[PDB]
Chain length 362, copies 4
């Protein structure tokens, strides 16, 4: 019951200042850390070879959009490869991101692994030598990190074991990050897979988050120097009953109010299969919910920000302008949504309404 | 996991409404639930025989203070005996309390008991037949309850066992209360005894509250239908280092912000033996602290509201008026305090 | 962590000695602690009024059987009422029990209560004032106590909350008993109700017992001064698949080997609705299981020891000898069973 | 509340047979898994250059001792490098180990790392890619593994976080091993450093082992297919009070009886810095303790088996025989001790 300060006042100030800059009013996160195995399917959809140059070019396309995205993007998450690549003008991507007022993030987990004795459940690995990697990434320009755990709703899931194990490992990952001046984004994703309804997702989300913050407390984590990346509370993808955006918003904010301490600097929602438009409309409704919310409620989207741009590009170099324009459109929209000032209008492509849901392959 | 609704929409509405009424803006709680045993020493200090009549008169004196206290008192905690007594005019005390706009509370725990194998630590008893008692109390005018758990800061305390057992028994007590329409006030008091500093109190408070809310979650407690009664964060009574009210306020608000969910309707601070003036000044600083507070921050005082009144009374019925005047002044003072409008005359460092 | 001895070497020796005497080779326990409301149906089955005198007579009938039962009975559990009744010769029942070489036990729990937010799950109450009660029972002749927690196998049960809460309350009960020189018998019964199979009962039984002993550790419980009363591992009462006695024995012993520390003095199995013969045959197979068992494996039966005697009696004083004869028959059968000497006439698959 | 079998009957039988063979009556384990950095200190103590060939020669010296050690050694733990080395005749070391009746073991953890917010406490890393590593080692001749967690007795240690985290990681390691047919040896070592007495060590050992087995249960670990490598229960090194071997044995067996389920196949004690003779006398006393012990109580020594051999060798090829003789003597002495038949010649429980 004795205190052995894990961080110093200076270390706390550095972590808190970083977390606040990432989720400053009107700002959100662009999750462009897709691996080669993942980005491959993306490039394939538009019939493009999955080469290092193509991946480089595509990342450059998103990172070098006009200055209209500056007020919209507070942070950009990159994959190891991209952190060490450069734009056509020789500027390292981390430098390109910062020159536009954004903070650089890096994925540090090494994927999910199966939990023996469970019904298809998993935990995440990547703690080995994480300290040394964080210290090096910090030097190379990164200020925050990404780590994803995955849970699923079923007849016997998520189980007591899965919840406890995933909560404990997130805490370890957060502790090591903070020791190296890196803001950890805690990500306990609850998949939308299944036919459960809204209230069931809310119940599970509440139990999961209560377990996550108890674990963070046991591990002496500095919450002001962290961010939370949860799933919005929605019905199952196969649920028959329909709900409005106001209901999803109310269920989501209620779950958070019952589990997330005010000390947490911000919440950056994951789209999880929602369409570009659907993701923006819900984020907006959440920010308009009548209930009191002591934390920033913004975005951290991957495909929900790139869908239209990826299609507009098509792998054709002469379509750069068209591609970037679609990206900019979604950034501005979400910027307004994280402020509760978004109202969808006329020119909203069909690709923006397409469901980006993919059944969890396992 | 699978949900088995512990409460219906109607039941939740009831508990939430009661909780909000108690901690409404500018309002607090008067803790007058002392037992014959715990009130003994006090009547002794003013040379007054400890008889039911004298107790009834004293309680009457506090509950019948003039209307100036109405906007100050949102709740009143009574001891079993008092819940069934009447004022001179024949009105049941619960009725007197309600007519002045206050909510009636009742003490339901049965005291602390020693935890074998610990360095003098305890847990609290009172769960047996608690359901039937809450239903009976509800029928007789009570809408919220009090249950006190006690922890101590020492070389090896509070231990892992004490923190875990006290947090678990508090959840059981809360569960039973919510099934009978009674708002449970969770009170995990960490004594100020000792020579520890301010940062050590903050550390222990953070760990305790964290354990408390995890246990409330495991037991499916409806937070919006509860209140929290914690100790303020301060140095031990024997600490040689000095701190300002602003530092006490910052440490207190920071600790709560790191553990108490926004859904909790309100926080009613225990006085923990502080003087009337000290408990008021500190509550004021807490409400003026810059940090954002998603819950009401008010009072739930015992001696911090009765001290001067008990003295002015001294058992003399002729002192009624003088005694009530003292109580009215502390009620007004704390009402301004819980709003940050009272005046007697680097957060990264936490 | 730091040590703060809950017991002295003398207190430990007293508890260990008591525990060993109860489960001495060939000895078991007679569970005759049925309440008025529980023995009511037992008496109406034989058209006998449920009066204090009839209950006193029936208990006397069992407690005063001839010396043939002495070597078979190491302990007898009584209900409050019976602990203060006397046989026709004026002798207090606790004296009658001790005079035959048996240890006296007393039921101390206060029944189950519903756990809010669960699918009909419960926990057990009775801790309030338990310390004073144990001190009094000790003076009146009791050396061990009984406390029953109930768990059920279902689609979503037993839940994480039920397991944790029941395990925790059993630990509080055990701690209080040992502080008063009373040997606590830890009873986490998993009902056989349902259509689940043998493997499912073994799984749940394994998870519950692990939680029970982690709890007893956290609360500093002296295991040598305790006994365990669990359910045998069997298929659900309505399971379609059928199993042999050897299978039941293997599932039961394997489950116990994976969770019960060798320090535990003994295991006294509950009958759980099994017939008199069935309960004896299963206990016999358990003792013949070709695996190492570091603890005594005996019995603590209620109806599985009284069924025939109760019927033979039929409420007629003229059938005293006949009734006791039936009791002696089951006492001898189980005495042989707990030794693997009873005759009515690939463990990696677990 | 539902079961989803992590292992099949065939997988359980395999893990169980391996565990029993390792701790069969009269047999123990030789821990020769020192790393390059660790072995450096050992070689430097005898003025010998720390080269691979020198390490190979030394490991060979122990692995090729005469057949007298056969009934004494049930298992041999190796470091990665040694698992892929060969004897002079060209035979792989794991082949040499098996031909002499021993089971081959491999160290799989990746060392300790500091736990932030604690008073110098740590946890252990090494889970990343562990499943692939175990499958590869199994194929190459390994049947059991080693993973070491370290806890320390102090003013505020072991803390709740340290105990909980170390117990959890050990369970993760055990789970992955069993999925690959490798028997995991759970090693929660409590350091003997400090001036604490016998009672304090027993208390701490009891609380640690309780958390360890609760964690193994939560992760669905098959106990019959595991072994435990705990510290003996002794006073701290700086403890002023003196104790007999009988008191050390009683406190050790008492702590184990109160926490280790009888389903555990065996207990292989670590020497924890004790002298060669001390570790043998205590192991013998532990086996003679007048209490019921439902599991095999044997050894898993490093320096308590190599101390004299390393010195007798001195790094000189001409001293091979003299060096091997020293090793054999300790192997024979401990073989008797884990049976309670040890002798210098060569042939109140309530107070705890």
């Amino acid at each position: 019951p004795h205190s052995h300060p894990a961080l110093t006042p200076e270390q706390k100030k550095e972590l808190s200042d970083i977390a606040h800059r990432i989720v400053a009013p009107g700002k959100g996160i662009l999750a462009a850390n897709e691996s080669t195995g993942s980005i491959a399917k993306r490039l394939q959809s538009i019939g493009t070879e999955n080469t290092e140059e193509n991946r480089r070019f595509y990342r450059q396309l998103l990172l070098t959009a006009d200055d209209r995205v500056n007020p919209c993007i507070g942070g950009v998450i990159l994959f190891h490869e991209t952190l060490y690549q450069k734009a056509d003008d020789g500027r390292p991507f981390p430098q390109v991101i910062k020159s536009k007022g954004g903070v650089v993030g890096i994925k540090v987990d090494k994927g999910v692994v199966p939990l023996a004795g469970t019904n298809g459940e998993t935990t995440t690995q990547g703690l080995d030598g994480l300290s040394e990697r964080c210290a090096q990434y910090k030097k190379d320009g990164a200020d925050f990190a990404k780590w994803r755990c995955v849970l699923k709703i079923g007849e016997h899931t998520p189980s007591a074991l899965a919840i406890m194990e995933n909560a404990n490992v997130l805490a370890r990952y957060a502790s090591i990050c903070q020791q190296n001046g890196i803001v950890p984004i805690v990500e306990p994703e609850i998949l939308p897979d299944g036919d459960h309804d809204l209230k069931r997702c809310q119940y599970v989300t509440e139990k999961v988050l209560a377990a996550v913050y108890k674990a963070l407390s046991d591990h002496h984590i500095y919450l002001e120097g962290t961010l939370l990346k949860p799933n919005m509370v929605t019905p199952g993808h196969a649920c028959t009953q329909k709900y409005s955006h106001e209901e999803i918003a109310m269920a989501t904010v209620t779950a958070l109010r019952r589990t997330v301490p005010p000390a947490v600097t911000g919440v950056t929602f994951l789209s999880g299969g929602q369409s570009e438009e659907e993701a923006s409309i819900n984020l907006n409704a959440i920010n308009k919910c009548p209930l009191l919310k002591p934390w920033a409620l913004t975005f951290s989207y991957g495909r929900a920000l790139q869908a239209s741009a990826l299609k507009a590009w098509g792998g054709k170099k002469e379509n750069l302008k068209a591609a970037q324009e679609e990206y900019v459109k979604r950034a501005l929209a979400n910027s307004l949504a994280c402020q509760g000032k978004y109202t969808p209008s006329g020119q909203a492509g069909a690709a923006a309404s397409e469901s980006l849901f993919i059944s969890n392959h396992a």
